């Protein structure tokens, strides 16, 4: 249910 | 911090939030 | 957070959202106490009867938010974690006695409109207002009821009260270490902390000083907003000497 976040956060 | 628990949009701009009035009138 | 209102922009900008990396979800609140420095709830991150031991890997914390749901782009700054520190004597045991842990950032993060640090109580504004029918305020995106979520940012003014009442509401021990906040069936108003909104603080704003003060972490409740229940908190000064040692020894 949540927007995506910037692929950098997830590294 | 010195500046801890001052909010830029309320404290720091002397602007009051609908509630904290409620809060105020709790501490007799 | 239930029978709450949508907060205000900026209202509450030390709020701190601890999410899950994989699978993408809320996993508790927490609040910014300096640029490195977060505060939560232990349980939100060790709680063996239900398998929970999150690592530093696990998460991140997402700071400057209003909206839940959206990446609040601009305005949100993300956080990864350094290092996870429990409370040595959390009992998880049992009745979530003192129920705190703190989170170093990687980096520090920079203060804007939306960021901005809480201050943590002394001793003196403690004894001053911590009493009986004195009223906090709790912030949150937890669920709106018991038994759905909110689209932005929750916030309730709840009565702190008095230690024999939050004792004879439950059968479960209460300790110096926590108090509880909440109306009584016979006040009419309600309101309290509902599953989600763990971890998130619990505030007052001092008339000495005019500054906001973290006097509470939301730990737990038989319920939500149950008549005859009330909400209990983590007593942030009474663990305030660990905090301290912690920030000293690893900030
Ligand atoms: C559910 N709730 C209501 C009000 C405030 C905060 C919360 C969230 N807290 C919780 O859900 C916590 C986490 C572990 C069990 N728990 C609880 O609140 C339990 N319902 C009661 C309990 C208290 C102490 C030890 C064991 C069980
Ligand atoms: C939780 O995880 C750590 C390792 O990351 C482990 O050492 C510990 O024993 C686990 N259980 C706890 C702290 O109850
Ligand atoms: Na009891
Ligand atoms: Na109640």
Redesign the pocket.
Known sequence: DFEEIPEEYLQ | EADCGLRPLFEKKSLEDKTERELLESYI | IVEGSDAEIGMSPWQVMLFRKSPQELLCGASLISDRWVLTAA?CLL?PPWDKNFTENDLLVRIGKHSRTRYERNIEKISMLEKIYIHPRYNWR???DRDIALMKLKKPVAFSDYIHPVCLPDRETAASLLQAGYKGRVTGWGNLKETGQPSVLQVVNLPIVERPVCKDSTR?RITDNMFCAGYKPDEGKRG????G??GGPFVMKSPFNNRWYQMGI?????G?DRDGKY??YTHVFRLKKWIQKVIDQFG
């Open positions: 349980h709680y049992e009745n979530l479960i309290d902390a509902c599953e909104d763990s939301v730990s737990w409740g038989e939500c909400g209990f």
